[PDB]
Design a protein around this nucleic acid. Structure first.
Lengths: 236, 236
DNA sequence: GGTAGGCATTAACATTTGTTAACGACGAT
DNA sequence: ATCGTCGTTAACAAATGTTAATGCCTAC
């Protein structure tokens, strides 16, 4: 929003200025660790991780204007080895390198408070996500994940709320729930067709009972009501 | 932590007096206190959430010098409704009104980078924990939770390493994962002495093959070394 | 108006958790 | 003495890790 836009035009007086990233490119990865502060101005990405085993995990989706750190400021070392994979067709991102960031945030306080705000939104997001996922099984982890995407990328239509996102493979949907196999997801996904809360037509997910999803993930719905009110209010 | 000691003195030069809370007291609360910045100087505490029915959830343990926040910096609204509950002897904590924080941080960049660092150490922490817990099921959750409890609260004794806490009822180990009955958790710890990794004595937990834990929660073990090296180094 | 991989669906088992119910001791009012 | 607390087990009801085989698709 407004705050995001002036951070945008804060960086551009200071000689760091965007880079186009395209689908499946990695702004940074878990094998070649460079420590950045990524200001993703526009587009859609996902934070992933491969293990010494090939087991994939979709931690989180970053969208719109947001900030992703790969380095600590005061120590300038890595925070953990992850992947910021682009999902949208294109994405603009401001790749600030970490031992630059302190001097930048020092000379303007309005914009540190911005990044501080987002990292606050992030701490509260993870805790919420962790809470609702951990209580009742993978089914909860699915309903939680669906509800997230349904709020962030959901659109109105006379057959339900559309999760308008590239091609959310069911294997990918399980990847956010820490699931290895599509069959485990297919089984769950249409307990949610029969219970009439989810349909899968046009190879895209349509939500029918938002109140169902809310019950299985109340801490997250709360997080939206508090940290992203404008979004939360579109679907009420 | 030498960085926090300066922050305590910094608070005291501003008339911020420490308050003493003591076992099972709630510094801030699920039914909106709020919102404060909580500088926890000494003691041990836990962050919990109670659902509408009665299902409880132990999201994180906070210990020693750390800083919690229930409010966003700029808007001073809630970041979510949780409980900070004193688990230990009786913690010492500086409770700062949030409106007072932005001003306090605005005029001493050193401490204001310090707060940012702590908040970076938990966005990283939360993510790592989300990862190891989501994969490898709830057995992996217990082991991952055992893991962080050793690194933080672990002495090494001629009987392995002692998880040196109060009274960690397996009811409570339980609340760290999402396992809501104390018999399911008992079926786990059971299976971990039979495999020689933990022994239950003196109403306290001991770990003697910590290597077994590090495989079930690798990105947690990776997180300590990366984020909290001094803590990691004492067991490696 | 035709091909080959890529997923979704669904079945059949192998384990892991969820749940309830007795039984038994420690520790505190 | 009489708690409520906590740990421990067996016994089961679901839940979900797996793998395999059958089909509809769409990128090509």
């Amino acid at each position: 929003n407004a705050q995001a836009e002036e951070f945008k035009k804060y960086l551009e007086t200071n000689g760091i200025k965007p880079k186009q990233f395209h689908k499946k490119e990695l702004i940074f990865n878990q094998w070649d660790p460079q420590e950045y502060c990524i200001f993703l101005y526009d587009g859609i990405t996902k934070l992933t991780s491969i293990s010494e085993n090939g087991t994939i995990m979709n931690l989180q989706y970053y969208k719109g204007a947001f900030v992703i750190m790969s380095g600590f400021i005061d120590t300038e070392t890595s925070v953990g080895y992850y992947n910021l994979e682009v999902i949208s067709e294109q994405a603009t991102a401001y790749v600030i390198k970490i031992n630059e960031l302190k001097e930048l945030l020092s000379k303007n306080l309005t914009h540190f408070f911005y990044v501080f705000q987002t990292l606050q939104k992030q701490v509260s997001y993870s805790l919420a996500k962790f809470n609702d996922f951990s209580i009742n099984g993978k089914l909860g982890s699915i309903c939680g994940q669906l509800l997230i995407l349904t709020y962030v990328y959901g659109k109105e239509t006379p057959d339900g709320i559309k999760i308008t996102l590239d091609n959310l493979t069911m294997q990918e949907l399980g990847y956010s729930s820490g699931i290895a196999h599509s069959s485990a997801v297919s089984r769950i996904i249409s307990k949610l067709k029969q219970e009439k809360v989810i349909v899968y037509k046009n190879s895209c997910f349509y939500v029918q009972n938002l109140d169902y999803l809310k019950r299985y993930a109340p801490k997250l719905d709360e997080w939206f009501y508090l940290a992203c009110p404008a979004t939360w209010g579109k679907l009420n």
